[PDB]
Amino acid sequence: YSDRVAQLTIGNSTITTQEAANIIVGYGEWPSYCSDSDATAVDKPTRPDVSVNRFYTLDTKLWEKSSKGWYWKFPDVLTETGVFGQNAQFHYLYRSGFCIHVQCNASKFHQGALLVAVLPEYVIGTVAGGTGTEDSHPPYKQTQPGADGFELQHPYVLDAGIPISQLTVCPHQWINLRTNNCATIIVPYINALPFDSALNHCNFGLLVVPISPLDYDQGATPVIPITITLAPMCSEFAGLRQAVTQ
Amino acid sequence: YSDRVAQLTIGNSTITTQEAANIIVGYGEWPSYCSDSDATAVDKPTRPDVSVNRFYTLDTKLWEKSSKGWYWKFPDVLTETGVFGQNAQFHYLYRSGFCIHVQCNASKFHQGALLVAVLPEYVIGTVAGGTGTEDSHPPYKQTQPGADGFELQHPYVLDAGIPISQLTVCPHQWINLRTNNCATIIVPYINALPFDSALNHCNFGLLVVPISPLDYDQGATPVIPITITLAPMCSEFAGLRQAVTQ
Amino acid sequence: YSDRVAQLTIGNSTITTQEAANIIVGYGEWPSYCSDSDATAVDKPTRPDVSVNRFYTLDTKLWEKSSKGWYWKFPDVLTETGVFGQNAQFHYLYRSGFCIHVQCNASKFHQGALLVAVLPEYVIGTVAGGTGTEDSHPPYKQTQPGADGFELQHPYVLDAGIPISQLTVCPHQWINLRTNNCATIIVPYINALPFDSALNHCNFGLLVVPISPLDYDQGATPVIPITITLAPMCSEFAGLRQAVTQ
Amino acid sequence: SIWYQTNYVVPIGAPNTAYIIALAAAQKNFTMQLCKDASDILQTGTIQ
Amino acid sequence: GDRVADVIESSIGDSVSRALTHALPAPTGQNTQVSSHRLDTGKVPALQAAEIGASSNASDESMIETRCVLNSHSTAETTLDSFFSRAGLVGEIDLPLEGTTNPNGYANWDIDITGYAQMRRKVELFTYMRFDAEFTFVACTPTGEVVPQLLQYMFVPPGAPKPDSRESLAWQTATNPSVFVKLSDPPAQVSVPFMSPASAYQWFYDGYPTFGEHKQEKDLEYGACPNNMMGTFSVRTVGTSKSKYPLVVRIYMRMKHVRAWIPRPMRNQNYLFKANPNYAGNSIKPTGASRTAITTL
Amino acid sequence: GDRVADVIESSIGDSVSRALTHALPAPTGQNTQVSSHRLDTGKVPALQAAEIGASSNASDESMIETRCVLNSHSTAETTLDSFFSRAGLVGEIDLPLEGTTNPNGYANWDIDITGYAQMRRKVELFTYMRFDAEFTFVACTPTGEVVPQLLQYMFVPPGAPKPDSRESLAWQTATNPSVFVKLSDPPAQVSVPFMSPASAYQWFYDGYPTFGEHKQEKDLEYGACPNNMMGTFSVRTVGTSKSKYPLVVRIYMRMKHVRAWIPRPMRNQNYLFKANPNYAGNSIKPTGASRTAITTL
Amino acid sequence: EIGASSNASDESMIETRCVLNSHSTAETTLDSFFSRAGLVGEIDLPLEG
Amino acid sequence: ETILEVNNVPTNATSLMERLRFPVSAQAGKGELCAVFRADPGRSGPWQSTLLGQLCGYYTQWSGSLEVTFMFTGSFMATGKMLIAYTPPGGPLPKDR
Numbered sequence A, B, C: 001y002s003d004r005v006a007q008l009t010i011g012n013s014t015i016t017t018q019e020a021a022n023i024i025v026g027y028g029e030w031p032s033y034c035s036d037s038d039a040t041a042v043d044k045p046t047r048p049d050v051s052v053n054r055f056y057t058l059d060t061k062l063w064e065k066s067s068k069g070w071y072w073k074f075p076d077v078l079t080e081t082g083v084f085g086q087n088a089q090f091h092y093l094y095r096s097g098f099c100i101h102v103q104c105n106a107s108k109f110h111q112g113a114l115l116v117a118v119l120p121e122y123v124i125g126t127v128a129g130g131t132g133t134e135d136s137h138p139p140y141k142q143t144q145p146g147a148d149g150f151e152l153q154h155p156y157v158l159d160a161g162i163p164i165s166q167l168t169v170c171p172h173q174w175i176n177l178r179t180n181n182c183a184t185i186i187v188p189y190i191n192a193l194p195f196d197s198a199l200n201h202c203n204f205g206l207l208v209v210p211i212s213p214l215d216y217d218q219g220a221t222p223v224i225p226i227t228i229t230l231a232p233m234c235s236e237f238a239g240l241r242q243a244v245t246q
Numbered sequence D: 001s002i003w004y005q006t007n008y009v010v011p012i013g014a015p016n017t018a019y020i021i022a023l024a025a026a027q028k029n030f031t032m033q034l035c036k037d038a039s040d041i042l043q044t045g046t047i048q
Numbered sequence E, F: 001g002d003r004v005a006d007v008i009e010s011s012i013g014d015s016v017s018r019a020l021t022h023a024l025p026a027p028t029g030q031n032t033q034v035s036s037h038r039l040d041t042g043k044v045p046a047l048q049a050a051e052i053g054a055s056s057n058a059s060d061e062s063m064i065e066t067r068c069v070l071n072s073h074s075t076a077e078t079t080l081d082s083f084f085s086r087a088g089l090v091g092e093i094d095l096p097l098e099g100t101t102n103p104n105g106y107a108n109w110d111i112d113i114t115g116y117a118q119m120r121r122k123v124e125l126f127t128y129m130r131f132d133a134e135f136t137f138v139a140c141t142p143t144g145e146v147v148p149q150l151l152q153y154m155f156v157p158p159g160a161p162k163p164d165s166r167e168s169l170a171w172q173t174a175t176n177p178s179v180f181v182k183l184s185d186p187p188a189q190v191s192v193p194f195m196s197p198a199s200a201y202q203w204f205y206d207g208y209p210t211f212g213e214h215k216q217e218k219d220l221e222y223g224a225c226p227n228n229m230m231g232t233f234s235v236r237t238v239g240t241s242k243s244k245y246p247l248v249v250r251i252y253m254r255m256k257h258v259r260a261w262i263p264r265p266m267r268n269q270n271y272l273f274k275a276n277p278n279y280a281g282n283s284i285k286p287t288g289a290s291r292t293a294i295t296t297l
Numbered sequence G: 001e002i003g004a005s006s007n008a009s010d011e012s013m014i015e016t017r018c019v020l021n022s023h024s025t026a027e028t029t030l031d032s033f034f035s036r037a038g039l040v041g042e043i044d045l046p047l048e049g
Numbered sequence H: 001e002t003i004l005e006v007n008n009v010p011t012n013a014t015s016l017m018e019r020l021r022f023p024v025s026a027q028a029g030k031g032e033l034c035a036v037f038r039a040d041p042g043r044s045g046p047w048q049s050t051l052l053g054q055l056c057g058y059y060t061q062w063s064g065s066l067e068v069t070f071m072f073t074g075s076f077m078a079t080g081k082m083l084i085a086y087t088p089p090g091g092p093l094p095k096d097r
Ligand SMILES: CCCCCCCCCCCCC/C=C/[C@H](O)[C@H](N)CO
Pocket: E111, E112, E113, E114, E133, E135, E153, E154, E155, E177, E190, E192, E201, E202, E203, E204, E223, E224, E225, E228, E229, E230, E233, E275, E276
């Protein structure tokens, strides 16, 4: 038995890792299907299981020596991907937790540390005209970037007035290049409602941001990519209609 | 209790009828999920249930006083329709039976009789160059018409050398305008395999063809439409991949 | 046993019908004689039974293709009719429920739907001088029309500011020409008093009004009459005096 | 939304056009929770 | 509660096919019970609705006063085994000395039951069939003469090396079955098991075997299920010098342990091609004979 | 068998949320057990991996020789109820005699807790909160003077008729709550239940409330959850002739029966707008004070 | 035509899940609907009018 | 149950009674749209004719299934089959059947 060697099998997907930290269970609470006492919709939901509950590789950013960090908004990342997104479009109501496996590996002569974090209801603010006298709002491509994700305007402030200096409150996991090469976060369905639109509302936001900068000598590898992988758990859909998008 | 008044509720769909014949159970055998002794694929299939198991209204032909009759090939009819077709595209293996509810109503001063029939493995042949000396083959739009369906070249011969004179062998149901106004056929998964492609292979074919011609005096309604409705039962999908079409 | 075939025998009267809807019991409460705990008058009332408890045919309106609908006020309809009205005149106090059998039949090639409704305390208002600046009041012939009844000024507004759009609250029954040919309403004595004058006060009002207009082609019958029939149930009279009228 | 599944079919001596009446109410799992004033007040400007 | 109820009750995954009807034994034809007159209201057997899709349930005992008949007529002759255990012509292989056809005493025949209408139509009555087979090989000259020649029949399953010569290296037959017969000997006969990857052979495949686009090129592969394409059949001379006699080999198939499944209407038009239900369009014939008037015989 | 096994075993529909941790009672602060020296190999508390995502489990008893401490320090002051049961400023309503602001003695205030940083930041520590409320209304003149005026506060829930006049017909209050106070009387105080359609109020809605396209027009509605938009608040004079005094009404909110859920980092930038986390981009400030060098104090 | 409301329940019109409904009906009672003080009169006593 | 005013035409305050009913006729086509309305009970305006609509007007919050019953008032000789679709939140007006 060991702590750093792990394997994650969901549906027909499988992730292996030999240099990891222990798995974080979000808020000390495993993802679950919705009870008959929490639910309110009378429709009999579809629980497609294997077809949608599986790992998805959606993006791969290049961690350069001077990067501000990126973020993704869930579950807008999958809405056009796979047979999960198909159910999320034909339906009004959706419910699921995720199994995020951020991954980034380098040599032993590289250094740097990422900060993987899952911040629920990550509302994004705008630079108010530089001076503070403009009630502007972010475009659709900033609040719902989707596949490619979005680069932070400023990383210190989390583009919302809140400090990254205390982001390790909500479920997080560091990727420190000298110890681990991947992070794994399991979150349950975090919402005040038993179901939600999945298109309009975004349950949380994945914040992949470096705090200690990537550095390396004149070695033989300067291209160090971070890759994002996720997998819906206990997925439920209700309120069937026509195919609707963004 | 009565025999002609019926109601068919599947998923979030519901069909009512007051002037029907009794329901036909195909080959005296209710549709069922695949056993662990018939199956051979080791994949854990998705059984999406409600989302895909529901009624679909896909076409409505106009029964004119001189029509040869039409046909549809299952399950190519739904491949681009609903969240059923989505599963049928992302997957390699598929399994389901159907609940076909052909419907056509007129007055009491109209006359005519349709013949609804479910012919398994309805392979279509071509007029061999008129003379018989040409091994031509039907186009894709004839063997896999899909949504709109296809009008028979010749109805006597069923475009395959076989006679319509004995089509009432396979599960059928007449729509005689002076008694019923709808037909209902429930078929199970009819195949020598536990699963099949759903895109390449077509389990059966629905043959809606009039034998006694529609007729009416100079009344106030000459537009008499036949409408096709179907609903997948016990749907299973396996062998997940990318979205593939025709 | 059947639901649409009914027969109503009271006293020496008898109504038959073969194309009806089920009987409505007013407010889910059968008409009854007044208890010794509800009553307050010390007089020993007369309960004439058969002589007054029987069907009365009082009017027959002609349902034309463009009619606003009519109404009657109970129990002013019988006050001059039969031996019921005699008791209602010689006495001060009266108590009874009714069995209203509105009836109207046409062919199978006619169409239209009536709305029979029993609205308790149907107080009638006036068009306030067209502009709203006149506190005029309805004549006696409008609030107490009696035998022939009264045609609505406006049917949308029920001549009282209230909408016919929600008249189906109080005990009602539709007469839809393609299904039924008669309506039947049984009401109990609806009042805050155990007895009342029967001349001054009117317990309720029968509202016979078409919502879907009568229509027919150039057939062989354009004269379609609606006929009103009613029958007092559990009739009681007290406070005997001389014969007094309107 | 309301679509024609097939057609409105009539014999020779009957109307080509008919009417449909829609009635509406709540199911038995229906509840209400917070008391507001009527969306529209019916007075302009003083009564009597 | 725990867990959710719509999963507990849910009939998802129900394995057994719910049978609406069970099979009863019928060794003899049905016997006929005695009948008497009946003048009643409500009991009416003769009146039925064909719209339903069912056959007439009206029995002869209720349509006419009948006597008693102890029917002992056997139904054995009408079984799938005793109907298909009839050897029929399924192939004719020609080995002429010199002609347009195969001139080197080696012929290859991709195994196709069809191409001979009588055996075809009988078989085409059902859509799916599963059976073991008994093949017989009759060899002679085009005149029917028996000559002292030595043939070699070889079964070449899908993927096995096909002979490209009269003296090909594939005739070593280190694995795939082959038979060595003289024409002097009586017809060679071989029993064959059911060897489809599917549970049954298909006489009809309503689809394509390949994926992708189906343009007018790959349109001839419509109706091609490889599950009942059991390979090719090859004959030798044997070598090494060319034969001295013209030869004809006829293949006969007998079915045993037969199990057909779903019934099919019966061909009424001339067969024109193998594995393809094409028909002459201008020469469309009625299914049977015709008369001059419906009021005459 | 029957039915299929992958349905029988399948954990689909598992209702209860599997708890990785249960709550223990902590009335007092944790006591400290005595500790001694330890010189061993393998037992190493101080060494930990922050990468994991967990906080230091290393206890002070294993980092330094400790004495015994019977800790009886209460943790009651640090509870959600005793932290939020503090009435704070949440609104200021102005009714001047003549100005740019409301000049007819009727003001409408769509109920927004934010717009006052101190009460906001304290509340913005959590993402979801569920609570009953106790509202207090302080009325006076802009100088703080108490004058003989009679106000009418009216709660106008979503969809109810908003007053468009000082003497509007909506002030009949036949259903929606309203309060009649004199300025002579002490502050009016009212208890308010949790009335969101959701299980909790949200200080953050990461999404749009409407469907369709979200162009630069309907882009200001991002972050607008109507579930914690509890309607508008209206004040009267009362009518019918205009008031004689300038008036100011201050609204104070006290929370009771509080239940917050998921924690959030704490604002370090100046609030600029209501229901909107915008910030001055060129004036980005550090979360705390700063010094000249890391090697000096 | 009968005069009755639709007896058709949602369980027979669509495949439904289980819902333990605990929504209270107290707010919708005659006492809790009418225990709301409303304006019913305005009496004027002007100096001269 | 009470009348759902799906037909909205104030013209001309005399033909107000037409507001209580659908026009349905012998369409000489396939699957033509008949009528359409919002399912929102407290919203304007078809539900505003119903007793439920006004009673809902005295309450800000509601919950539960609703029932809309359609009665056909044609002749007995008139027949017909019609689809009636409920499209949950999200998604636009269904362009075709
Ligand atoms: C020693 C030689 C033995 C040869 C063994 C051959 C056995 C083949 C069994 C018959 C398989 C079914 C025949 C094929 C079906 C039809 O001809 C076409 N495929 C119709 O599409």
